[model samples]
Target: SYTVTVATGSQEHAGTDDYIYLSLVGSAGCSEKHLLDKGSFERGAVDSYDVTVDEELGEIQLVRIEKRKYGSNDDWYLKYITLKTPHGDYIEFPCYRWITGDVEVVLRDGRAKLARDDQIHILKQHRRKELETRQKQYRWMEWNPGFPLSIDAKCHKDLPRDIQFDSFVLNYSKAMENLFQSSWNDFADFEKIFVKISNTISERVMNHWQEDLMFGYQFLNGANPVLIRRCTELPEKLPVTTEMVECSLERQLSLEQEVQQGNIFIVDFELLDGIDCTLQFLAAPICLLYKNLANKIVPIAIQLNQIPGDENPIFLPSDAKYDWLLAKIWVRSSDFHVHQTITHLLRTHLVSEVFGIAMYRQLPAVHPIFKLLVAHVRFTIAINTKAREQGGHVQMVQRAMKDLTYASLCFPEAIKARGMESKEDIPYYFYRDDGLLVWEAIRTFTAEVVDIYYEGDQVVEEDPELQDFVNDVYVYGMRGRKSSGFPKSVKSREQLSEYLTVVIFTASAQHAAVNFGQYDWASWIPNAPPTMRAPPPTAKGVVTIEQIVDTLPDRGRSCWHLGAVWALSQFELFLGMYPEEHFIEKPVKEAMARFRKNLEAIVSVIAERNENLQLPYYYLDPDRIPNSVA
Candidate 1:
């Protein structure tokens, strides 16, 4: 048998201080020692404990232990421990003690916003330190790369996901918290930071998920990957510099003329894949939906090159022209690639979500699930705005103003999530003014999440490049509403809007209903017939960015306004404010007047195009009101 003992190595305990210590010469397991039970402490002036052991083969080993509820007012330790066996075996070891104090300290501080002058100065100093560290580490050429990663990431996501666009705005506004919390370990008092971050994350998710729900509805309606990609990617590659794209885009006007004739083109099996029919049908509706929503909210930004200030007006200085050209090229390259990636991902994820359910061959899953998901899309954005705005205060208003400056920056996840589709059932709760409340409903109910297309009261430009892009795309991609000698009208603008919106709404509601319905075992949608067959899987293997780009429609057919109609429309309003002569040169001036006449002619053309869509009841009003009425 063996005997065991335990003691602390610390020599003594000091008052009101903390320390660490260790014990030895005892069983390693806490449960076996019974230390948890007898040694447990309740408030007391002092405490005591005891130990037990068992004898085996003339030796003793620790069998159990106990302690009083409380220990001496001062922390203590019984130093070295010894264990001895009757057979002459023995061991000794040192032990230590740990201590704690009752005192606490609270620290609070104030700081400026990240982009402010004072903060910028501090950041410049920090940047210098970082630069020095880097230089010492490398001793080579300075890595003067492009803009910061956050900016790059923000620009990358802003074009496609409205949520990412929103997050970039909200979080950038809250960067001021770093000044106070940068070195502080605890964030317990910074309610504003938490509020901003939570709003950004939740709203970002809400937007991402709503995209999923809408795309799911599109997928169910039969939109194919190819047609969707081609339609979306077309505008990105258009010539932002030369008028070559515009000339080609003018061909789209011809298509619009046919649409005015009320002719709907039918896709017989003889024409491309059955998928092509779905894409063809989806094009006009998607375009219309995008136009209606985007124009209502998100404002398009004026590129540095495009905003010819007095120093470089219509008759620009060489550098301004050069800058414009350079920016055009960058936007052409980056916007197209990024926008295509986002649009394509929306299609794929949506198809995956919708088709996955179809693959299961269960009607119970499809109908209810579709409804729920659709509802989520419609409601989440409105809900988030409500949730975040209710508790807002003057301080938060100040913080929001700071964030608005970085409207061009985005969240870290915004890039990845910008391309992902999410759901709308999730509730969004926000802390505004130190209180929690419901901010936004599920976003599934929103018809579209429009971005800011119009700035405050001012117009930033006078020419309509972006608006021209949208008009061109809608006309060409949908290929007008007429054919041969006859006009065959199937869908009108109002009809298309109602149908598409309802389809999306229905799909979302169905999706959500399916998920929540399962809780009660109710099915909202009717089941498919047993004879129904699954469509073949998408061409095997992975989809590459090149494949996506290569598969895009040629430049003339690109619909750049697919997700940015609101932004471009805002640009249109901005341009409208300035006298036309201020922005347009002679050549553009002539082309625009003719273009205006063409646009007027297209009212009938747009009307015709709406007829063939075959969605439901709707009207088209393509007339440009000079006063700029929606």
Candidate 2:
């Protein structure tokens, strides 16, 4: 227990007609255990409180002081206080400085110095260290050599001024292709390959351009403006603290309050380099908003590339030009948004570069599968958008669209199994054994599920039978959308089919394939650079399909594989929900029955595949599958 006294600064600033309250903090700025509150005091008067704390919890570290005018106005003005502890220790803080925060007190030689939060200080120290390191050694320059070749002066195009890049790409591509194709068994080879490759790409960009290229440098730069806006919107006096696992529940509540108030401060960054650009850009706005609180804002927990005194807008190496920026912002949860700027850049201004410049371009360009997948994505998005416009079951299909592309990867296993290489071999694989099963499953889903709901033609209204079936099976069964009845404007079976097409591709076939097929493929070339360190499945030195599947888990099942099984079961549940004569005519029903049998075999194959590798049969229980209700 201890006694404390606070001296109100002066009469004019301290309202004579109003009341003042002071508080002693227990935890960091987020607790309600105030040692003193609702106490009345006058200007120059020493208000006192008897403080008692549990010794086991240790000592207190913060103080808060505030005041309001007469009556209930729902507004308050902060006032300064000179804190005097039982030991005769005292310290003074500014009236405006102490609003909405814990006064961090540091004691030395029997004296105390009051400070605010440490979030910004830590952020700045780190930024300064990075800048110093870059100053000492500009490794990016060595890693990214200048670009070679000159464009025709007479040509007209966007930016780098010339429409012509044929010779530029030709020379660039030739250099890269030879380098990537070379046999390299050691670090010595790695060093030479990168050195020559870097020189080839860098020399062209350096020699051909004046200012650095903007669109492809970093994706975070695009989101930078958003952060600046967010920061400016925060209230003054709110201290953004770095996220700490040691944080108490009270602290979490305080943090939640900040978010609810639309003022997010103190972003604790996980990664601090190029990978962090997304979060760094996000934190910038909050940092600036905190600055608006006082004379200077605190640096957040991560260094922002946009900070003043930077040599470049993006303060990271440009050696790997094809590199994509990715970040996971840890607020309450994580948000992942992949940017196709690298792909876009290649498609736009560097069209010729892909053809002639380098084999490295093949990494982003090499995805025949990904390219084809986009066509489906666009169709789904179109139908999904139409459903939303008509006030239909948009959300169900939207979730399905989210999982579609990854689902398409599952189909590649058939390609892998048949020992095919060129894109031409696709049709052959689709008709072969297991490939035929999955392919027909998707086709059946498209015909039975999609056509029934989407109303295959625009002139006719969608069938109510399919809509009701979806509501009962998907809406009520999976999502519990009981508040709203079936959609009113779902006209045209084609529209219904369009919606079901996305759902089937996404939730049904797409779901099964990714978990079973793509997961296996990813293991073969996990994290390999497209045209650099590793070769494609068709390329020399690449491992075979048997070798790829040999690495599967021997025991537990993967989350995706189980998710696929659950999806297949949901389709089965949908079929079982209605009578054969109601929604399914004999022709479609028989077709569906055949497809379902084949689908079952596909599932069996995946199970055996997993068992052969000794991976545990994890997630086999249908009850454990989330949203599997039908």
Candidate 3:
């Protein structure tokens, strides 16, 4: 038999309607054996509760305390505990603790200590301090008032019947309470500090669990008034000097050389100076999904150095001739043109909910897709208005602006999505598949272009670059389409648009259907088989950042993969746009109708696939049903 005495801390209290339940774990086993009944503690009162132990059990191993049904603002605290045995041996335990959650007291040498090793002790202490600091900063509300920040020994669960310590959740909110409070005016600047601290908190949690579990921290939360910082910070400013440009240009030349030599070229974005306009610079670490001569996809990080400006004009005064050359290739390329148009359509229709203004107006021209459009528009406006004065051709600028405006006018459906509208007038809804919507817009735009622009001209056979691009796409990108019964004739602009639209639907839209937007893979951990396969082990371990970049099987279908598809889509559009014509013959129209039929069939298959996946679709367009066989 035994008598247990729990010394309530100075700050401990029960809510007006809270209850405390106490249990014991011993040689008889760790299953919670209740000692004190529920509703045993009075408000702000701490005292001893009597408990009976199994005589057959040699020694008690753990004491468990649980606080339940507390008022949202209520908490119970335990300062120290003494377990008095019939043999007259007793143990005392110390806890500078909050009483909101579960805590286990371990018995050692007649002394009860918060159950943790040295490392866990340090981490828990640090986490507690952070929560306390955060609470002190904001006292507008008691977010988790009286919930004792207690780290449970059983918080970490193992896989497949293992009963070992696998991970720990360091509850910092238990470490201390807030004494400082701020006014609403101070919320803005302090909001900045809050994000910085939140990041620190996340990092600390990751670091604590990194080594122990490949699946790190189970859940992360905060103390009173826990503010989640969701806004992104502005880009850093780097000096765009001569040395910077020259060095970056040299690396660019080398990368081109490497690609030409049939080797996988992986460049860090930080090393390269001015290629934000290029599809290669991504914030997330993504490897090239395309195979090199060796038939292996190279994991490359193309880090482009960038400078801060609200908006940089297309033409900079300090650019070298080579820089101009690179910029021209990127802007004038078919890939850039098509990507810009489609991306514009997508953001305008899909992202407008969060971005009050048109997507381009809300972003720097250097942003993805925007970079290409901004540069082209600036060049067109400049060459026509200013460059023509300096002996540049007048017809060139007039044609360029005329073409851009014509393209915009082609998508009459797009005008419906612009600006604020009533519910009944909203162009699209939350359930619409954005990818499908964009594809529909682009297809309509392409067909209209064929009717308006391609009146009598023959297929563009003379432009070797254009011809080669089309031929390569058919050989490499259109394999599925080719095998799936697409037309063999690759001559007419309308045919090109038809095939190109199919390619965009298959590659970009299909991927977005599964890997991006609504039903994205980011939400859950990759396991095996039925869903996506788990990332394989690289030279690095299975779950390191490097391994994630180098080995995630489906990463090949990431941002750059979508970029490549759009590049092809844009290239096709570029070909169609280049002052040419071959209006719909009966065969071109038949071919386009067939491709549209194929598009619907493929979309149906993709929809079924996602339904089987059973994951939440995050990118679903508003007010539309999921794709159906009908």
Candidate 4:
């Protein structure tokens, strides 16, 4: 077999890859620049050394190739590098990483050129940012409240914009801050786990995480408001310096105090404590709540639940306070009750603000508490309007209608004859208006539930028999009433399904908004643009799925591009662990081959996208005009 030897001239040598050949088969950022190292060498017997890449600017990666064999570390290694382009048109040095000492390139193809070391360093600087993107995308810690689009193309049938995206975002952000503030980010060895999980579901989860946090980063410190990172551009490494790892904990604690006071959502600190970083808050929420702001009041979800014993439910801490509120969910989910919000507000102030639990970081007198007040007021206005829009009044009427409708029916022989006795009570379990009614209903209901043929009730069409069976099976009153007994001690397993649904739904919605650009009906403008409608799918050459996904304005194509790329790579990686003659099915090999082919096509597609973006053209020669177009 023929062999090739690759060498690195300087400990650090750089050059323009200048149309160097690459076989790419994955989803990478079209707008981002990556560093590629091409080293060639010649030694006795003819062997090759894998050159490691470092500091990928955008979607670029720092790939490592271990040494198969080594004789002397001192051979002049020949490595050529340049800012790797995405799938697009135009030609220039990939976006500048840094500016400093330059190098000369000598390609094995008998080509030579000069490159810079500062540029290499500049590319490396993105390491910190890349890490940040990886974390956010991995965690699925955002809520997208996007502008609404046409319900139909006619644009005549109008609906009141009713989804409270701003509130959802505030709630989600607070939940995120609370989560990260805890041991989650630092718990166990989670870096790899988190990165893998996010990337595994990269099309949705990781992609969305990138959008939310990158949005945060862009607007966090008064940076360029217009500057945005593509979902595909987020880096996927776990780079944690002593500073990053430790600060992660400190920030977590600070956020806990803020959450305790209902202000854990936004990074409002002028400067993050013990760090040289200052934050610039995004003001978009201000506009979101203006309607309520005009009313001089805001609303909030004031109920905070405690994590139950024996349950590892993560959101329990945030959702528990809402138990009292949840009790009214059937009838009051829409109500903008000021009682809980105000009560929680006062509670937070006394616990955190007055007690100085938040003293670790020097905060202004108005820092966290003010945030609570502001969020609460905004939420208050939003909920009231939404409730009205959601036909809260109509719902009350519907409930009454349902009740009357149910009352007109004659009770079963056991029920009407027993008259709310131990055996007859099950039928009225959920129908009882209050806890008193529940106690009055369950005793009879439980016994009869097990024996009776489940003739589905007109009152609750949803699993009426199952509901009765469940009520009968459990010791706690499932009758929705129980003023006296300990509020239904739901077993861990019993509640798991419901809670997991919440988690999955939250994750799915967040992923879609961030990665795939799907949105709630009421998140955007009077008429929002179609999600992922921008960026024509093909530019030149052949277009790959990954390229199409990255080019869209949003993550809509992520399902096609990022999803397939990550999967195929993982499959190929698994195959590598097997012997060459492992003799996998012909179909498997064919699938791999198709993946590779598509990847190659997409690689060029993405490269052209980045090139056509004209990032280098703007950054490098902002003021200069070329004598020739080329």
Candidate 5:
């Protein structure tokens, strides 16, 4: 007799009155199927059963499991299964997903395997058969004309049995009651949206929304912090002469001198020029910022369009009160587009989903690379598939699609390429400083995992499973777009290690930096409003608070916007802390511990820096960075 233990997940509604049966497949032979008691399956519960076989199934390789229930619509979840042989050895099979309907599922041992090492016939067939089934279920779909491919699902219910989350809490009942029930008019009306959603950061952002110091601080430490670069030279289109912006600067400096001194920085909303601005106005603004003698980063010049003309005036800090304010607000709204579409969704969320789907469909559960990345990408598909069922995202993605490169996908390389690496030029960039620590930690951990699995360059090249996984990602995930430059295959352990590092880094730290701030910066709608109702001003003129309020997000739009950002900003856990732990081997497990230690060490560094600051840039802290979009 062999003792088998099965554990159900703790997610809400994870239990079902299902008939679960299992058979042990070993090299010696297979065990006859035995039923696991129906009463045993319940949320967060563990149950054990005894399996009787005629002869010893030598070295169990697979578990053939099936689920049957009175209704195919009911839900069930499986965390993992463990079996103890009569000979006193234990085997593990990890299955951390919902098992829907009456269907059979097969699982191999959790310890990773390679095709070259697996000479056994049944395991070989298991690998091929699993991929064949996955290929059909996880087929790719083109989301935009030139954009990356996404999962082919219509809704949450349409997702495959294993891909659905047991629970996804969007219970904004009270929040919606207070928010959606009202139409916004005055600025103070936003407090209604914050009924029970009062986070420290959100409250602070609400108070400091109009301050220029906090405005520039968001470029350094807020959502979509990745874009701002110190301006060494002005773009020809944004020709802000000395007279236009010298009012905000020290008396000694001209625009040319400041550009030479690297005291000026720029944020060009260049891609927004051709965007549809009929229903909702968006500006392609080029805002020039100056680091004054007072050591404050303040906006000096704002041009609301690409081409210069009499109509497109370069508003200055010294312009009419609400005119300059409205110009800045226009930039804030356009930035919301770029942040939601390019930075948050396309960069972190969608890329993680592609990597997650490709790994599951192409790499076997036993593949070492699969083990390396599974935790980071876990629960990714559930969020993204639902988001798809839920548009500006596709448009901005279309613009970035042709130009996106693998180097841009990584943290350090993309920062360096942007030429914003000099500390002297941009003194207090918290995102760059803290992100380096998280990136190196993950990169180092990935390197050790790759070293443990791959002997050398040839070992990586020789691994058919590794090559096939990459090939599938390149062909399907990238939509076979050659211009995107996603590698079709890995030639060495170094490349593979770096590749995994980018995926993990993007999923965790990058996501935290971009996503969590949705509530903090944007919770104050005027600060980072996603839409504007007024068109760009044809010429600089007398503007009032009334005009600006009319230009802001309308009644119902603001409510929907507030509710959505609140839901999106809700983070679940920290970086490097994976629940339902999967990495089992000692070496990789030690590496995981070392990574968490590394994150802890960096936390002290950031905590010390935030001591004197009004608002701390703690989004990238290990304590807040979730492992996935969940």
Candidate 6:
């Protein structure tokens, strides 16, 4: 006699009115089919049953559970199964997902393992069968000639069941009052959109927007912090000498002396030069900055075009008040374009889609990497596919293919590559500092799981599915850009761990940094103009405040820009804070606890830092970061 106890999950609509059956599997033999449908499997409920079996299913390994629709094709979310064997010992199996009509879910015992760990014939064959069926369904196709590959679906409904959005979408039509039919006359006109949706940070952005200090701060800590780099030497394109910015420099230092003394920095927007924007006029501006006499970073010169000619005059800080401010505004407009194209979409969304598609098509459900990543990659395809259905930046996508490298995907390496490291002098970077803390925590957690699955390098080489998945990502998703240093196959356990760490971080923390703060920083028209109504000024002397207002985005573009970011910043899921334990293995469970505690520490540190800050840097705080772009 065997006694079986079953539990159902507590999520909304998790229970089912379906006929449930089970077949116990063991090393020696298998048990006959048994029905445990005594009106059981209710939401947030539990039930137990006694099974009569003559056959001895010795040393049970798995329980094959099936659900058949009883009335109207219902689904079931089985929580766990605890079986009391004939020897008075108990065996458990965990199933944390839904089982639809007439489908069988084989619940393996609560231990995650690599492909090399499965030595039994039936279990080994089951892993292979799962991958074979998945590749046939989750197919891939090219998004563009020089872009990353994405899911093959043309619309939301065309995608498979696993990768569709389950909840709400935006209602942009009714949210805006003026949809491209009006133009702003003053800064006060922005109040119409902010009437209902106002926050502490957005209000702060509006209050101090024209200050030179705030302008420099955004380059270090804003939504697009990745672009600013330490400029030790002046570029040939911007031939600015003491003649242009001499009045703005220190008492004794020249422009060349500032660059030589390591106090000069520049943010270049040359990528916007050839991008024919669909909205309004675009300017590929380059701005120069240095530490002022008071030790505050301030922009001294702004060139609104890449080619340094008489038509592209360099606006100086000593210019007329509105002229200097408008030049700053145009630079912000270009910043928004680069941030959306490369920082948010290329780095987070498109890169994550590659891993999501490859994981389904190559790795089976039982593989360690699959179990570790399934939750973080959830809804990734759905969102990326939805955005694909919406549009493209064709030329910028081509430029990314030329510039992106796998080393750029890593947070620490990429920061150094940008020359943004060395916190001894130019400190107070919330994104870079807080990001490294989260990065180390995720890497530490991943190494433990990697060590558990692969004991040696030989294990990595022996697993054909592991190699196949990496090849799938490199060849299909990344287009086999060998010069980019994207790996075709993972060679060892350490290499595999590093790959997973970057994938998970980009999906969660990196995505949140670029997103989630769009409205906060951009809601004020001058701070982040989506488009400029007028062309770049050839000369910089005479400009009025009214002229600056008209040069910014008009009614329709501003409405969409404000509304789009408002929609995006609406959700935030704290990373490392799992609602429930998905990784059932005991060792992995312990590793998760340590990771969560470390994340808790970061939350405290960021909170204290926010207390002293005039405008809080809330994006990189762990609790506020969305766990997935999905």
TM-score of each: 0.17, 0.22, 0.20, 0.14, 0.93, 0.91
Question: What is the Å distance of residue 19 in model 1 from its true position?
Answer: 64
Global CA lDDT of candidate 3, please? 0.30
Cα lDDT tens digits, model 6, 414-527, are 888877777756677788999999998899989888887888878886778889988998898888888778888888888888888988999999988888778889877678
The alpha-carbon lDDT assigned to residue 183 of candidate 4 equals: 51
lDDT tens digits, residue span 135-244, model 2: 23211111011111112112222112011111122333433344355553322333333323332222333232222222111111121101122232234333323342
Across residues 284-339, which tens digit of lDDT does each residue of candidate 1 receive?
Answer: 11111111111111101112222223322221112233332222222222222212
Task: Give the residue spans of candidate 4 off by over 4 A.
Answer: 1-510, 513-586, 589-630
Query: Could you give candidate 5's per-residue lDDT for residues 509-612 as a string of tens digits?
Result: 89888887788788778888777778877677767888888888775566666776776554366687767655567788888888889889988988998886
Q: Could you tell me the lDDT of residue 540 within candidate 1?
A: 21
Off by over 4 Å in 5: 69-74, 167-174, 178-188, 191-199, 277-282, 391-393, 555-560, 567-571
Error of 4 at 515 (Å): 6.0
Worst 10-residue stretch by lDDT in candidate 1?
Answer: 429-438
**Best first by TM-score, ranked:** 5, 6, 2, 3, 1, 4
Query: Model 4: per-residue lDDT, tens digit, 485-564?
Result: 22122233223223212212112211111212111110111111112222221112333445433322233222222222
Could you give the C-alpha RMSD of every candidate to the true structure, in order shown? 30.5, 32.0, 30.6, 31.6, 2.9, 3.5
Q: lDDT for each of the candidates? A: 0.23, 0.28, 0.30, 0.22, 0.79, 0.79
lDDT of model 5, residue 385: 77
Show how many residue pairs clash in every candidate, following the order shown: 109, 43, 29, 55, 1, 1
Assess the local accuracy of residue 532 in candidate 1 as a C-alpha lDDT between 0 and 100: 10
RMSD of 3: 30.6
**Which is the leading candidate under TM-score?**
5
Displacement of residue 581 (Cα, Å) in model 1 is 5.6
The lDDT of model 6 is 0.79
Candidate 6: Cα lDDT at 440: 89
Model 1 misplacement above 4 A: 1-341, 344-584, 616-630
Off by over 4 Å in 6: 3-13, 40-48, 77-82, 173-190, 277-281, 293-295, 390-392, 555-560
